[PDB]
Design an enzyme around this catalytic site. Structure first.
Site, PDB file in Angstrom:
ATOM      1  N   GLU A  97      21.918 121.726  38.389  1.00 24.12           N
ATOM      2  CA  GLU A  97      23.078 121.996  37.631  1.00 24.12           C
ATOM      3  C   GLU A  97      23.617 120.728  36.897  1.00 24.12           C
ATOM      4  O   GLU A  97      23.642 120.852  35.624  1.00 24.12           O
ATOM      5  CB  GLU A  97      24.422 122.391  38.473  1.00 24.12           C
ATOM      6  N   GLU A 127      27.367 124.115  33.078  1.00 21.30           N
ATOM      7  CA  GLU A 127      26.548 123.343  34.037  1.00 21.30           C
ATOM      8  C   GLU A 127      27.471 122.265  34.719  1.00 21.30           C
ATOM      9  O   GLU A 127      27.055 121.557  36.094  1.00 21.30           O
ATOM     10  CB  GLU A 127      25.230 122.627  33.305  1.00 21.30           C
ATOM     11  N   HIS A 130      29.309 124.168  37.180  1.00 19.97           N
ATOM     12  CA  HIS A 130      28.424 124.462  38.415  1.00 19.97           C
ATOM     13  C   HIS A 130      28.097 123.162  39.316  1.00 19.97           C
ATOM     14  O   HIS A 130      28.163 123.349  40.483  1.00 19.97           O
ATOM     15  CB  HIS A 130      27.208 125.026  37.845  1.00 19.97           C
ATOM     16  N   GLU A 192      16.185 129.638  34.951  1.00 18.69           N
ATOM     17  CA  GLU A 192      17.298 130.434  34.954  1.00 18.69           C
ATOM     18  C   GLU A 192      17.091 131.926  34.977  1.00 18.69           C
ATOM     19  O   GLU A 192      17.525 132.931  35.790  1.00 18.69           O
ATOM     20  CB  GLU A 192      18.402 130.293  33.944  1.00 18.69           C
ATOM     21  N   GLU A 226      25.560 132.764  34.156  1.00 20.53           N
ATOM     22  CA  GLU A 226      24.283 132.813  33.770  1.00 20.53           C
ATOM     23  C   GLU A 226      23.636 133.464  32.633  1.00 20.53           C
ATOM     24  O   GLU A 226      22.843 133.223  31.744  1.00 20.53           O
ATOM     25  CB  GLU A 226      23.287 133.189  35.149  1.00 20.53           C
ATOM     26  N   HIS A 229      23.270 131.609  29.496  1.00 21.99           N
ATOM     27  CA  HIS A 229      22.107 130.624  29.725  1.00 21.99           C
ATOM     28  C   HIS A 229      20.823 131.311  29.254  1.00 21.99           C
ATOM     29  O   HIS A 229      19.815 130.875  28.711  1.00 21.99           O
ATOM     30  CB  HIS A 229      21.968 130.020  30.836  1.00 21.99           C
TER      31      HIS A 229
END
Ligand SMILES: OCCCCCCBr
Ligand SMILES: OCCCCCCBr
Ligand SMILES: OCCCCCCBr
Ligand SMILES: OCCCCCCBr
Ligand SMILES: OCCCCCCBr
Ligand SMILES: OCCCCCCBr
Ligand SMILES: OCCCCCCBr
Ligand SMILES: OCCCCCCBr
Ligand SMILES: [Ca+2]
Ligand SMILES: [Fe+3]
Ligand SMILES: [Fe+3]
Ligand SMILES: [Fe+3]
Ligand SMILES: [Fe+3]
Lengths: 510, 388, 166, 388, 510
Positions: A97, A127, A130, A192, A226, A229
């Site tokens: 992350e 990130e 995260h 990812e 997510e 991403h």
């Protein structure tokens, strides 16, 4: 004179026009590709609205953790093995992350289209969220769990062991060092898009199965971020699809990225799940084949064919080497248990039955090994035995791949048994596969990572553990243990008395 | 579906008893404090520090790193993932920085979200309360739409100057601060556009297209040197610290503060405009929040580094001299905007006094911290030459 | 003393670094150090476990000496050796653009780093170099990346094959 | 202990197994919607309505009540806990009212909390930015400290006018709305003191004491009729609907809207005061918020009551006239304030424009609703007759 | 230019000066006391900080509810009996929270000191918060629980039964009808100060024992606001302690308030806990003595001695009537089960053993009765038996106290068996105790509440149920049930076929 306002999409409509032209308006990073000037993004967000949507998720998450879950003593009522697994799961994921923050800053710099930059920017912020979430999981289990050690200092105790080196390859350096596009493939198109389900979602399943409701609360929240991403990853390919360089380099970078990520993911995740739990959710073999091979390697990647993307040419080798990979690696992880920051357990009776049932031939190989180590007293401090000694006696050297950092014992593995040793300019190098070998041969200066044997050579085991603070608060008991029971924990002296001294296995070669 | 097929270890009787049976009598270590080994900046370790410090896996060869050995994969050519070679500044420990506001992701998005919702309430209240009736038309259509509008590109450029730093910052605490400084700048650029989009909705004929403000930015005279400075700061600087320091401790502290506070915030009220000041309030709050972090990093940690204090101050003095010239040019060109105002709006004395406030605040908050010998009247006289 | 973070080798070099009281001597020592101990082309692997840390300590000394010796303009535009940074950058990039193959290219990029890495060359010029040199190196290296069999690639790299298993 | 001594039925194996065994195979009724019997005001039932409607245990003899019978315990003498006798207005159902903003307790405090935290951030940025340097001293020390401050007692008095309504409201939806209306008023009053306290901290000799602003309210001439009107709306009215109606649909819609917006909100900017407007922005947002609720209750519900439309419009038209006068007097006396402004601050041409804005806005939002034919020119003329 | 701001306390310092003297600046409500205009409050809050402190609590609460608790299916995994209990607990508490809003509004109007007004004001807002919180509890169990009926419409279905009447007397009318000070005594000095622990905290304990983690999450949050209300109650006494009227009326209004509140609380809460649960926390007799008699009646009240406050003279009388009170009442509640909006369950073997153990003599009386009713088929619709028939058969009349509305059966009760019956101006009145009798005699016009027998007289049972919507969504099955199992639920017809008709028991004296 009616109440009116302005939303995110209404401002976003004009965001693409925010960037302007000037001679030096170009990326600061080396790259073989050209990201298209007019690339767009899928989510029409602005800073304010981005903050609000994440703030709402946080309320829910922290509300659950601070109130109900704490009232339920959720931090404690978790299987000992799973408490240990989360020390690694959460801290190792934390670095992925973290480096992804830098990775998306690099991608933001690479993008020339204001919208594509903005898309990468949302990820930069996600990130960071995260990183703090993964930190919070370790923070929570340290504060309220059955064994804070490791949970409370993984950031420095992770440095003692060899498995951490491999994690940095796929989730740290692999995310930020190289062509920005190569980094994007490692992070987004592979990492990812391919691991979100088999890693993040799967972890919440194994967690719940072992009594852990803390991780599901946090990881399920992480998961909701997510989609953005994966979209960034997809758009990266789109942004470079129309450049002639794409047809020349895209599949090569993608293939290298795929091998890099799977090389570590395949053996390590399967190991954490099957050997780091009591209650089993699903055999790793099928979880892998479904998500990595079928869903990603087939469906996902297939949708990008229109952009010239092909199935990684090494996908076949990955599948072949996969089957026994995690089983082969746990043997080494347990054998080197004193180098970790977590407690390990030998498979119990129900587990061996589960293993043999789901992986025929398991018992005749691994099963019997564990039974002997058990007999040798590997769990008992007074035994003076560490599986490490068994490898010596049976002449089964453990090497460290110079490229992936993944440890391998070719003389014992039921899986890949390849070994390649090269000498170059006064230095020896050891490789476990043909893909990593090419990487080093073609790019020697990218892979000069010192391995544990090279750094620890001539050092006595307990001295390394002490210097790197691998002890509990009493300053004597090891954080790492060969069993997860509450009594008979090994101390630094129990290790020192064994007088184990590191040596570089490659030195034997003439 | 009422009970479900998935059995959870926390609530399933059979599984829970297995779990409980395996549990130890008490924790295997009484030290339940994650990050206990981190040296606290304040009385006791904070959640901000625990969740942040050492997340970055630096080895000891990058000041303050706890890991060891080379990176596992470097760039083609050999460049390290992170390295000392990416900035001129040196320190005994890159992890010493501390955002005085202790902002990790949660508190950061919480506050910004509060601001977003209050902003929405404010606009609905402003429009329903018909307060737009009292706003001078020329100020609204000329200075807000064109000149305040063009300023969004200045803030957008400063936002982008942060991209390289997001990638090269040598520590977690600096990366997080740096990311938040940058994110606040794009937020401001977006708030300027938000105001224009709001005016288009409540003012017949008002075009929210960025065409006008953008043409002013890219080809006008008022912002010519500002744009040249922003283009340089963003794309000609490859040193992540030179960028953050020059942007926040030189250019934005002088040019940015003058434009936001001494021009627009100062004159908008005079034309019946309480709308622009609403957003400028956010921009100034953001500027003051960033300033604390910028001062901690460059002055408390680097400029006052026990081993590199002298060296770092020399470098920062160098950067201040380097970027002060382009910053003065930006202010000098901006002076041209005063000749566009209706007669009687303000005078040379007010303009000058306001320049001195900005210059004096800068001397106190920034220049003096590294012993940069700034001459306030020399700086002001140079800028005033831009007045028509 | 053989520790990971603290040992005799490191202690020794810290002393050796304290004796660099002049820029030219220190800068030369740093460049020599890079030729001797960094990259796969290093003259020796004797300092493999401590060179990264030692190099950093040496960089610190060169930077401090450079800042005190150089006027403001030279600190920004001249290398520690007195060369015009821009001229070096452009000249090196020129050679890279003329490189005939990936083998000449890697030599160019790697050599540039060993000789000009900050605090020798100003960071702005150095990273602009990383930007341009890295681009050409990858373009040449990643073209038909898998065509050469490993048997032949081992020969081009020039490694001595000690052992093979499969 | 690590596990604790208390066993919880959700996690305890033995206890949970017993609970699970007792559970039905599926829910014993598929209607899982609480408040499903409530008639939605919109497309689908809202959380706001479900959680609020019918909380008040009124019997059917109080329009809309679902219960039956007399109350269990009444006042000495026999007065009912709640009764039709506490208000002149009549309706087919006291539960018809709906807050357009649908505010139940959670959303209400969430919003106000955000405002409180942003306010604190604003004040810290304001102070740190040194924006006080541009504010006119006289305006600050005289108009803000004395006249703005004295206005706090006006808002405080209006807040207190709600006390009886909090007790007598005949429904939950109305009670919650009323409470929030009064709570916002005391908030404003406290925000007036907050500012004065903020000034006392950043302005050397500024006295935060209410001593000065209080005497101005209790003995001044500018707020003499304002205070007289407040004291009446608060302690002379015993009808909770007359109080809420007259306070929000008459007195505050005219006087309050003028003092706040057409005076301080309009003149503050001119003296370099972006501070006071920050708090007025809230008061106005609050005013507009309450307005949507006041309108829905007295117009949409009572004014347009299928059976008492005429009767109520009559009563309200009657109240508008009863308080339109005391409200006129309040403004007139306020006019005397301009004579204290810095010569040249404003002209009679501006006041007339503002006065009509208020009056006109009033007629478009309140008057025309219950058909209270009023003359804008005569009102403005009567109020304008209080100047120099 | 140091960053500066201002807090609640810094503003509250000047709050007392906010109020100004003038002609009619006096309370609009009748009262025998004079609250000193110089009275202060304990918490220096202003509107904005109040909002913030509560918003934070809401965050945690709703977060746990929407996230973790829902993921754990907490709305379902609760014992059937407790699911039913919460229909009554949350909705009945809801009305107390609601009327408390009006009560404190009245007290706010009574207080002359700005600070005392402000203190009451905080409670006004708090009670609104609590009203919505209790509403949310029913809302949540309705949406996610095993039986939504009752939870989804209690606001109207509670009007069918007699227990609701008594609730309104203590938590609705007792909180707002009468001298403002008498209302304060009922609500704050007695209600809140005395019941907060034995009711709100105890509920969270009983809830957890029965699988309910929803109620604890909410009720524990409600509890954090109560200190302010207890302080308000305390300051109410302080504010009138000087006035001579206090020595002449305080202890009287206090005794009446105490008896009023305990009259309902004693039997009803004990009933809900012991009979509305499977798992027990503590015998109600123990809880009552410790909190009502000891802690409140002793410690708390004692501290108010310096202000002329004395322990209620009826305190001893209350303890005497309390022992069997809840047991006596459940017999009546179960016998009249068709009039509720919740399902009832007879004690199982373990429970009866528990009751006998903690209440010697319980089995020989209640235990045998329940077994008799069960063997006769009170749980089975085909039996044609409803316990109320057993009361008729054995001539055991059930009366409704004209003052407290609490149902009582003199001829059967193991507890109090006193009965006073009077006739006045053509109306009969039934009283269950000497205190309530005096209340009616002295204040006849305050107590004219019609009882269920008077209103339902001559009506057939299923008719009352049907008209007041005592049905489930299928329009045939009763909400109320004599058992908590999922099969063999009673329907409107199962009731109609029995032709039970209401009669005014008092006319038997004609
Ligand atoms: O809980 C078991 C720990 C998992 C071990 C292997 C380290 Br990646
Ligand atoms: O999102 C942070 C980067 C790593 C993601 C891995 C997919 Br589970
Ligand atoms: O491939 C990713 C490897 C992850 C190791 C522990 C993380 Br959940
Ligand atoms: O099995 C019992 C039937 C459920 C009753 C239906 C209620 Br809507
Ligand atoms: O607070 C609301 C009024 C009733 C409180 C009773 C104490 Br449990
Ligand atoms: O003493 C009053 C008793 C009321 C209890 C209501 C259910 Br929590
Ligand atoms: O859970 C059983 C419900 C309790 C019923 C007695 C009425 Br207050
Ligand atoms: O006390 C006699 C019980 C009353 C019978 C119930 C009739 Br619906
Ligand atoms: Ca020009
Ligand atoms: Fe992530
Ligand atoms: Fe991600
Ligand atoms: Fe309450
Ligand atoms: Fe209360």
């Amino acid at each position: 004179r009616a109440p009116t306002s302005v939303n995110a999409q209404e401002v976003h409509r004009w965001l693409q026009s925010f960037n302007w032209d000037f001679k030096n308006n170009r990326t600061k990073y080396a790259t073989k590709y050209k990201m298209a000037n007019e690339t767009k993004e899928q989510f029409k967000l602005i800073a304010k609205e981005y903050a609000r949507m994440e703030a709402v998720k946080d309320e829910r998450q922290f509300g659950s953790l601070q109130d109900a879950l704490t009232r339920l003593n959720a931090g404690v009522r978790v299987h000992p093995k799973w408490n240990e697994t989360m020390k690694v799961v959460s801290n190792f994921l934390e670095v992925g992350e973290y480096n992804a923050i830098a990775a998306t800053g690099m991608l933001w710099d690479s993008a020339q289209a204001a919208e594509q930059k903005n898309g990468y920017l949302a990820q930069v912020l996600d990130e960071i969220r995260h990183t703090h979430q993964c930190a919070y999981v370790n923070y929570y289990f340290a504060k309220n769990g059955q064994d804070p050690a490791g949970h409370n200092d993984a950031r420095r105790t992770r440095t003692i062991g060899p498995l951490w080196k491999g994690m940095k390859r796929v989730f740290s350096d692999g995310f930020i060092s190289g062509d920005a596009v190569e980094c994007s493939l490692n992070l987004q198109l592979v990492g990812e898009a391919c691991f979100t389900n088999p890693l993040i979602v799967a972890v919440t399943e194994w967690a719940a199965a072992n009594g852990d409701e803390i991780t599901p609360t946090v990881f399920l929240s992480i998961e909701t971020d997510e989609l953005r991403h994966m979209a960034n990853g997809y758009q990266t390919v789109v942004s470079i699809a129309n450049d002639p360089a794409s047809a020349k380099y895209l599949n090569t970078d993608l293939n290298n990225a795929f091998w890099t990520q799977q090389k570590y993911f395949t053996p390590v995740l399967g190991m954490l799940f099957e050997y780091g739990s009591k209650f089993k959710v699903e055999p790793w073999v099928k979880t892998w084949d479904r998500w990595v091979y079928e869903d990603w390697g087939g469906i996902w990647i297939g949708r990008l064919g229109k952009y010239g993307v092909e199935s990684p040419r090494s996908l076949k080798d990955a599948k072949q080497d996969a089957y026994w990979a995690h089983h082969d690696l746990y043997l080494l992880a347990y054998a080197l248990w004193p180098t970790g920051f977590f407690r390990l357990a030998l498979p119990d009776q129900e587990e061996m039955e589960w293993f043999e049932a789901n992986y025929p031939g398991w018992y005749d190989h691994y099963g019997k090994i564990y039974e002997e180590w058990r007999a040798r007293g590997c769990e008992d401090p007074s035994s003076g035995f560490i599986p490490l000694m068994w490898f010596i006696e049976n002449n089964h050297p453990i090497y460290i791949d110079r490229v992936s950092q993944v440890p391998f014992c070719p003389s014992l593995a039921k899986g890949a048994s390849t070994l390649r040793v090269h000498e170059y300019n006064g230095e020896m190098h050891t490789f476990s596969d043909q893909w990593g070998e090419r990487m080093w041969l073609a790019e020697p200066e990218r892979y000069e990572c010192q391995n544990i044997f090279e750094q620890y050579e001539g050092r006595e085991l307990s001295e390394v553990i002490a210097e790197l603070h691998g002890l509990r608060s009493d300053g004597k008991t090891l954080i790492a243990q060969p069993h997860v029971r509450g009594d008979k924990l090994w101390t630094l002296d129990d290790i020192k008395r064994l007088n184990c001294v590191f040596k570089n296995p490659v030195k034997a070669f003439n | 579906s009422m009970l479900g097929e998935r059995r959870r270890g926390l609530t399933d009787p059979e599984m829970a008893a297995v779990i409980l049976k395996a549990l130890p009598e008490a924790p295997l270590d009484g030290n339940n404090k994650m990050g206990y080994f981190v040296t606290p900046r304040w009385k006791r370790l904070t959640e901000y520090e625990a969740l942040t410090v050492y997340a970055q896996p630096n080895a000891d060869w990058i000041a303050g790193g706890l890991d060891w050995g080379d990176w596992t994969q470097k760039f083609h050519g050999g460049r390290p993932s992170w390295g000392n070679e990416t900035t001129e500044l040196r320190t005994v420990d890159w992890f010493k920085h501390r955002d005085p506001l202790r902002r990790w992701h949660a508190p950061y998005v919480k506050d910004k979200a509060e601001e977003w919702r209050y902003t929405d309430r404010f606009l609905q209240g402003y429009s329903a309360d018909g307060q737009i009736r009292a706003m001078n038309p020329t100020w609204r259509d000329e200075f807000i739409n064109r000149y305040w509008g063009a300023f969004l590109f200045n803030e957008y450029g400063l936002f982008n100057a942060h991209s390289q730093g997001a990638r090269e910052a040598l520590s977690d605490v600096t990366r997080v601060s740096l990311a938040f400084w940058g994110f606040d700048k794009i937020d401001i650029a977006q708030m300027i556009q938000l105001e224009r989009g709001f005016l288009a909705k409540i003012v017949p004929g008002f075009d929210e297209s960025t065409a006008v403000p953008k043409a002013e930015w890219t080809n006008g005279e008022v912002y010519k040197s500002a744009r040249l400075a922003v283009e340089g700061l963003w794309q000609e600087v490859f040193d992540w610290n030179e960028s953050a320091f020059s942007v926040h401790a030189v250019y934005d502290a002088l040019f940015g503060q003058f434009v936001r506070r001494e021009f627009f915030q100062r004159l908008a009220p005079r034309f019946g405009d309480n709308l622009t000041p609403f957003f400028i309030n956010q921009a100034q709050t953001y500027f003051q929040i960033a300033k604390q972090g910028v001062q901690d990093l460059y002055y408390n940690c680097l400029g006052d580094d026990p081993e590199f204090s002298d060296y770092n101050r020399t470098v920062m003095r160098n950067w201040t001299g380097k970027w002060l010239e382009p910053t003065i040019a930006a202010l000098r060109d901006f002076m041209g905007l005063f000749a566009k105002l209706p007669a009687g709006t303000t005078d040379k004395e007010e303009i000058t006094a306001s320049l001195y406030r900005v210059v004096d605040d800068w001397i106190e908050d920034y220049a003096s911290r590294i012993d940069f010998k700034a001459d306030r009247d020399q700086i002001v006289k140079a800028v005033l030459a831009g007045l028509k | 003393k053989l520790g990971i973070h603290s040992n005799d080798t490191r202690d020794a070099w810290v002393n050796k670094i304290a004796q660099l009281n002049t820029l030219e001597k220190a800068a030369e020592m740093l460049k020599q150090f890079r030729m001797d101990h960094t990259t796969p082309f290093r003259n020796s692997y004797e300092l493999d476990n401590d060179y990264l840390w030692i190099e950093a300590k040496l960089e610190e000394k060169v930077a401090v000496l450079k800042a005190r010796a150089f006027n403001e303009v030279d600190f920004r535009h001249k290398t520690a050796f007195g060369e015009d940074a821009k001229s070096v950058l452009d000249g090196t990039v020129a050679k890279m653009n003329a490189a005939k193959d990936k083998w000449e290219a890697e030599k160019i990029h790697i050599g540039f780093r060993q000789a000009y890495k900050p605090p020798i060359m100003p960071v702005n010029y150095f990273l602009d170099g990383e930007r341009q040199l890295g681009t050409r190196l990858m373009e040449l290296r990643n073209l038909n990346y898998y065509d050469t069999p490993l048997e032949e690639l081992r020969k081009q790299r020039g490694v001595r094959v000690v052992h093979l298993q499969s």
